[PDB]
Amino acid sequence: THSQGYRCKTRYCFARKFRRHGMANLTTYNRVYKLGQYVNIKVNGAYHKGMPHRYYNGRTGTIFNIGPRALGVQIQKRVRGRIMLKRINVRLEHVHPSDCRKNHLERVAANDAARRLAKETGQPVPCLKRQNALPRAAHVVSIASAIDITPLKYDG
Amino acid sequence: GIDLKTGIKKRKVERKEPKSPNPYIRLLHNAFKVVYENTGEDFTKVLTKRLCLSKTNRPVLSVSRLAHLMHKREDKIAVVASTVTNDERLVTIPRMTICALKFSATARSRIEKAGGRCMSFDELLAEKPTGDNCVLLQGRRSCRAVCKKFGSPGRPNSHVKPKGEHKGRRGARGRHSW
Amino acid sequence: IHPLPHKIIIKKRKNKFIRFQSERFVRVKPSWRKPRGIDSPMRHQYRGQRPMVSIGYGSDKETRFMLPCGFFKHRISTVHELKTLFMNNKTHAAQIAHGVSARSRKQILEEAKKMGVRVLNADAKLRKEE
Amino acid sequence: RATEKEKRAALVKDHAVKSAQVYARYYIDLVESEKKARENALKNNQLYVPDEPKVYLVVRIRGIVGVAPKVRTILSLLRLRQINNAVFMRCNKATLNALRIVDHYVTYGEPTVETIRNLIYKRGFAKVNGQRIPIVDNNLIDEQLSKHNILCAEDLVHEIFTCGSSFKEANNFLWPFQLNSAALKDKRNNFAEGGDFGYRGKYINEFVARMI
Amino acid sequence: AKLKNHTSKNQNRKDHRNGIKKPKKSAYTSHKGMCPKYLRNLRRSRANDPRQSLR
Amino acid sequence: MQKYIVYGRRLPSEKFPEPEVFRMTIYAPNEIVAKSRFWYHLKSLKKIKRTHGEILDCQHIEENGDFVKNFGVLLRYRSRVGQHNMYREVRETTSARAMDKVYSEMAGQCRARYHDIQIINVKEVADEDVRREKVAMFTQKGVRFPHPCPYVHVKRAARTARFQDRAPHV
RNA sequence: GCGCGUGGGCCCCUCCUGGUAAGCAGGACGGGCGAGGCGGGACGAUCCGGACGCCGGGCCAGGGUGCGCCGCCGGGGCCCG
Numbered sequence: 013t014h015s016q017g018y019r020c021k022t023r024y025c026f027a028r029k030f031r032r033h034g035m036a037n038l039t040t041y042n043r044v045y046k047l048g049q050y051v052n053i054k055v056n057g058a059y060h061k062g063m064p065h066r067y068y069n070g071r072t073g074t075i076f077n078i079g080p081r082a083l084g085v086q087i088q089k090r091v092r093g094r095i096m097l098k099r100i101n102v103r104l105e106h107v108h109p110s111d112c113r114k115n116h117l118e119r120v121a122a123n124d125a126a127r128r129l130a131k132e133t134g135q136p137v138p139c140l141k142r143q144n145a146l147p148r149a150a151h152v153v154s155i156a157s158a159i160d161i162t163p164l165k166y167d168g
Numbered sequence: 169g170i171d172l173k174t175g176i177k178k179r180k181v182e183r184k185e186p187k188s189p190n191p192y193i194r195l196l197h198n199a200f201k202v203v204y205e206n207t208g209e210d211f212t213k214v215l216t217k218r219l220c221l222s223k224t225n226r227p228v229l230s231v232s233r234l235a236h237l238m239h240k241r242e243d244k245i246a247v248v249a250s251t252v253t254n255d256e257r258l259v260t261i262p263r264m265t266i267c268a269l270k271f272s273a274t275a276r277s278r279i280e281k282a283g284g285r286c287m288s289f290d291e292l293l294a295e296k297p298t299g300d301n302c303v304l305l306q307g308r309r310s311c312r313a314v315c316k317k318f319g320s321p322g323r324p325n326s327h328v329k330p331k332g333e334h335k336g337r338r339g340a341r342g343r344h345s346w
Numbered sequence: 347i348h349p350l351p352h353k354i355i356i357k358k359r360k361n362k363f364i365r366f367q368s369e370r371f372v373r374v375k376p377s378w379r380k381p382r383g384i385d386s387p388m389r390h391q392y393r394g395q396r397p398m399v400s401i402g403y404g405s406d407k408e409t410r411f412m413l414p415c416g417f418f419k420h421r422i423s424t425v426h427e428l429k430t431l432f433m434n435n436k437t438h439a440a441q442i443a444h445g446v447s448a449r450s451r452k453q454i455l456e457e458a459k460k461m462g463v464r465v466l467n468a469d470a471k472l473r474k475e476e
Numbered sequence: 477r478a479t480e481k482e483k484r485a486a487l488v489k490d491h492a493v494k495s496a497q498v499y500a501r502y503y504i505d506l507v508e509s510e511k512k513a514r515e516n517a518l519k520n521n522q523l524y525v526p527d528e529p530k531v532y533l534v535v536r537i538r539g540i541v542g543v544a545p546k547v548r549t550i551l552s553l554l555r556l557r558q559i560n561n562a563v564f565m566r567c568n569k570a571t572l573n574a575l576r577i578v579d580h581y582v583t584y585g586e587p588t589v590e591t592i593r594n595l596i597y598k599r600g601f602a603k604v605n606g607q608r609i610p611i612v613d614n615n616l617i618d619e620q621l622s623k624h625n626i627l628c629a630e631d632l633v634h635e636i637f638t639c640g641s642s643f644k645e646a647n648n649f650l651w652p653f654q655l656n657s658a659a660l661k662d663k664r665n666n667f668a669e670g671g672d673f674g675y676r677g678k679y680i681n682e683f684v685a686r687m688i
Numbered sequence: 689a690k691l692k693n694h695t696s697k698n699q700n701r702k703d704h705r706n707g708i709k710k711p712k713k714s715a716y717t718s719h720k721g722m723c724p725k726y727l728r729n730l731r732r733s734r735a736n737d738p739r740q741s742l743r
Numbered sequence: 744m745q746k747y748i749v750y751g752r753r754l755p756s757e758k759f760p761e762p763e764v765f766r767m768t769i770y771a772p773n774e775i776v777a778k779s780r781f782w783y784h785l786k787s788l789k790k791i792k793r794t795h796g797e798i799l800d801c802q803h804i805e806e807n808g809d810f811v812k813n814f815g816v817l818l819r820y821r822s823r824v825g826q827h828n829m830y831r832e833v834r835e836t837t838s839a840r841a842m843d844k845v846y847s848e849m850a851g852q853c854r855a856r857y858h859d860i861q862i863i864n865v866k867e868v869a870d871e872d873v874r875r876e877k878v879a880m881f882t883q884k885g886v887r888f889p890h891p892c893p894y895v896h897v898k899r900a901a902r903t904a905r906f907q908d909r910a911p912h913v
Numbered sequence: 914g915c916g917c918g919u920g921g922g923c924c925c926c927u928c929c930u931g932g933u934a935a936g937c938a939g940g941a942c943g944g945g946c947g948a949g950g951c952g953g954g955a956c957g958a959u960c961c962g963g964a965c966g967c968c969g970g971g972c973c974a975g976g977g978u979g980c981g982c983c984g985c986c987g988g989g990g991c992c993c994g
Contacts, residue, residue, distance in 0.1 A: 076721070077722050078723070084721060092699075092703050092707070093702070093703035093705070093706070093708060094707065094711070095709065095711055097715045099721050143568075144568040144569045144570040144571075146568065147528040147530055147567045147568070148525075148528035148797065150524065150526060150527050151524075151525055152520070152522040153523055153752065154520065154522045155521050155750065155766075156521050156764075157763070157764070158750060158766045160767075161784065161785070162863060163862065165817070166828050169539075169559075169964075170558040171543065171551070171557045174548045174557070314914095315914095391950050391951095391965080392950075392951095393950090400966055401966065401967090402967035402968090403967060404967080523750055523799045523800040525799045525800065528797075540963090541944095541949090543944085544943060656971080656972050656973080658972095658973075658974080659972090659973070659974095660973080663974070667775050668779040670772075670776075677774065677775050678774070686972085690939095691921060692922075692939090693940090695922090695940085696941070696942090700943090844989065844990090847989035847990055848989070848990045848991090850990070851989070851990025851991050852991060853990095901986095
């Protein structure tokens with residue numbers, strides 16, 4: 013690069029989508045935000061105030077500050093061998109809620125629900141640990157109709 | 169032949185001995201290390217290592233700090249691995265048993281006048297070697313003037329002070345000066 | 347005159363680790379020097395080069411310093427100094443020093459003969475009768 | 477207190493004599509069960525797919541020079557740090573996926589009970605206090621794995637062959653096996669292209685027998 | 689005359705030699721850049737009842 | 744060299760609780776290579792990648808080989824120009840044994856390795872049906888031919904250290 | 914915490930820019946030589962294997978096995994390397 017201004021190499025990044033140009037859906041302003049919430053930062057090109065740099069696009073973070081018209085987000089940038097927490101102030105339009113912890117949050121509640129039953133009906137508790145697929149099993153499969161397949165002669 | 173660098177963070181050096189030419193310190197370190205080996209007590213392990221630490225690592229605890237630190241537990245014996253220096257600012261010192269490597273002349277007199285006992289590490293090894301009814305107390309290690317000037321004065325987030333007079337306005341008058 | 351039985355002494359290298367290029371020049375004395383040159387064939391240990399001094403060549407701690415007679419050496423210069431060998435040094439043996447004159451060697455050897463201490467150089471300076 | 481060492485020996489020995497007798501009958505029940513199940517399926521024009529492999533024996537076949545940074549990390553976790561070293565792995569999607577990344581540096585397959593016992597008894601060493609201590613007696617296995625219910629050597633061979641609950645603790649207990657030189661033929665082609673790297677399946681046992 | 693203008697080779701290795709260091713723990717909780725009003729309220733709120741260290 | 748009947752099917756899905764089973768007769772050195780070839784085929788012929796499906800059974804079919812039969816092999820090989828189609832007939836005792844003779848004569852004459860060649864089919868052809876003369880001459884009731892290589896008894900001379908008194912007659 | 918050396922690099926793999934091209938110039942991921950012994954590639958800094966205390970026995974990688982020169986045969990096909 014010979015020119016490195018705030019918005020360099022942002023031709024396809026900060027551009028709007030095919031049919032998604034225009035003003036922001038009012039939910040972006042309406043959505044409530046809480047301190048410590050996980051937020052995914054996706055820059056919207058139309059709004060120009062509070063725009064995070066192209067580096068901050070695609071970065072999940074946590075809301076250090078909830079302030080008038082702006083959310084402060086702590087994202088971790090690896091500069092050289094040191095990952096540094098960077099505190100950025102992004103306006104509503106360029107920040108979105110993140111489902112990063114949603115699977116953990118879902119699992120915590122499901123684990124408790126099985127445990128709650130284990131305290132009452134069906135006292136034994138099922139394993140509440142994720143298993144990484146595991147190596148299949150046995151089973152008997154009916155060959156019955158098995159299609160005999162042959163490599164096909166080259167065409168061209 | 170063997171990749172032994174992928175997950176190993178390298179050996180970390182520590183003071184396994186007291187570098188002190190002082191006989192008494194070497195004799196006490198060996199004494200409490202033998203206790204620790206025979207009786208595996210944390211108090212004797214922490215004391216064994218505290219004896220091996222350097223003078224900068226071991227700061228003085230004053231007779232006003234020890235009074236405040238032992239205010240709730242006057243019964244418990246206050247074990248210091250450095251020197252007790254008196255605080256004249258504390259007019260009246262409370263009475264307590266203290267065991268330190270050294271005690272300044274004023275601090276030996278003040279505690280004894282109060283009715284307290286100035287014990288020694290040999291007396292501790294004889295009376296309470298494992299450390300029953302004893303508390304290991306330390307002085308502030310960052311109290312050193314050198315520690316305060318460590319860093320990069322001139323960096324925005326330093327909060328350090330420059331080494332030397334400097335006497336000029338570039339970089340010192342503000343974040344925007346310079 | 348006989349030592350403790352001991353374990354076979356094994357020497358890793360009989361030869362003496364001559365310095366590199368000590369044959370080519372008289373100025374380079376054969377005392378070992380670590381090869382420390384940018385393009386030194388000896389330090390790169392390429393094939394055919396002389397061997398390199400290393401701790402691997404070290405002899406067994408138990409048999410190290412032991413002389414071929416199975417005894418260790420203590421260099422004595424006087425009859426009082428035969429007190430080290432006197433204090434139950436059944437393992438060690440005595441060497442008289444080169445400075446000690448034949449007059450004094452005779453006295454030292456008599457004390458050794460009473461103690462039973464073996465003297466390694468017991469024929470030294472014994473030229474006929476003085 | 478000095479005594480009771482003999483009392484543990486009696487309990488450990490008792491578990492050993494009963495375990496070998498029961499485990500061997502368990503292993504022979506498997507062959508009869510699989511062959512009969514295959515016969516039953518054959519009558520119904522069905523095929524009995526056997527269980528997909530539960531444990532793999534993985535042997536490093538390439539050396540420490542020029543290894544990629546990711547490949548080095550995966551092989552370190554797989555405890556393969558030197559050529560000719562072998563470790564057991566548990567077959568899971570995560571383990572299987574990372575094996576594919578380091579396939580060029582290893583050969584793997586499913587070990588038989590005979591292969592398991594020979595490695596455990598001829599080349600088996602333990603990690604105690606991070607030290608490689610030879611496995612010559614059942615007492616050592618009991619002093620580290622009875623918490624994991626593995627008092628005897630046969631109790632260990634069962635844990636690895638049948639991928640039991642205490643597999644993570646028993647496989648870590650065994651120190652990565654250090655084995656003799658591998659016969660190989662081509663170390664750069666894959667057992668599927670005629671070379672030796674990658675999955676060899678039942679042939680892992682033949683490869684390991686030479687290196688014991 | 690002309691020498692190399694730029695190289696990145698080894699720089700990643702040098703970074704990962706002991707690196708990929710996480711950024712402290714105090715930084716994740718620091719009150720730098722926080723809302724001046726919220727911070728004043730926090731001080732007033734923690735300056736009353738058991739939390740208060742005012743004596 | 745072996746002859747295997749590898750059976751396979753895509754992994755059961757919600758849309759397809761029972762998937763169709765495919766059977767392939769694959770000649771290969773070992774079971775591991777045989778299952779790789781089966782999936783090389785199902786990946787292209789049926790869009791079933793190995794990770795998508797599973798091998799129900801790999802079954803080694805051994806053969807009785809006490810009588811010579813003419814095995815005709817149709818195959819496709821990729822040359823330096825590109826894929827070609829070829830029919831080769833080999834007279835051998837067993838189908839695995841004739842596949843070895845076909846892959847020996849495909850590497851030697853056409854310079855195609857086992858992974859370049861794909862065998863369309865192997866089927867025993869009777870003497871009347873042989874279309875290739877190199878196999879036809881042998882099929883006739885009585886074949887009398889001089890020993891093709893009677894000088895090959897020079898194996899005897901390596902032992903002799905080549906120091907025989909007279910030059911041996913052939 | 915204290916501090917040293919370094920800040921002319923160059924090769925391989927793959928991905929590239931300028932150029933007719935270059936053992937040319939300029940970049941990228943990883944590796945290597947630098948600073949890596951040793952066996953092979955006839956010879957070579959970097960290639961292919963292997964990365965080194967001193968030894969004895971055993972195995973065998975890569976690369977080979979007429980004779981220089983350690984180590985080979987058996988089978989199928991082809992044939993003025």
